[PDB]
């Protein structure tokens, strides 16, 4: 079984990082919608944090698997 850990500030760091990474990515790549103050709506934010949680969870589970944590 892959080794996962209880929540720590490092897990929080990975989630926060992945979320911000996806906010910036969503500002660049979402085709239908002041770098972040132009056309930034709730759907765009909600979609990017949805992916940020998907990417963050995948990253946390993988970095816990390999030992990086």
């Amino acid at each position: 079984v892959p080794q996962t850990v209880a929540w720590s500030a490092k897990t929080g760091a990975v989630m926060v990082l992945s979320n911000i990474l996806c906010i910036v990515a969503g500002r660049y790549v979402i085709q239908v919608k002041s770098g972040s103050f132009a056309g930034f709506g709730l759907p765009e934010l909600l979609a990017s944090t949805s992916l940020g949680h998907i990417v963050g969870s995948g990253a946390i589970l993988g970095l816990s698997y390999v030992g990086v944590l």
Binding site: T4, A6, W7, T11, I60, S64
Partner: peptide, 12 residues
């Protein structure tokens, strides 16, 4: 708590 804190290996 293990689900939301992403400590999914508890549910093994």
């Amino acid at each position: 708590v293990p689900f939301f804190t992403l400590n999914w290996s508890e549910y093994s």
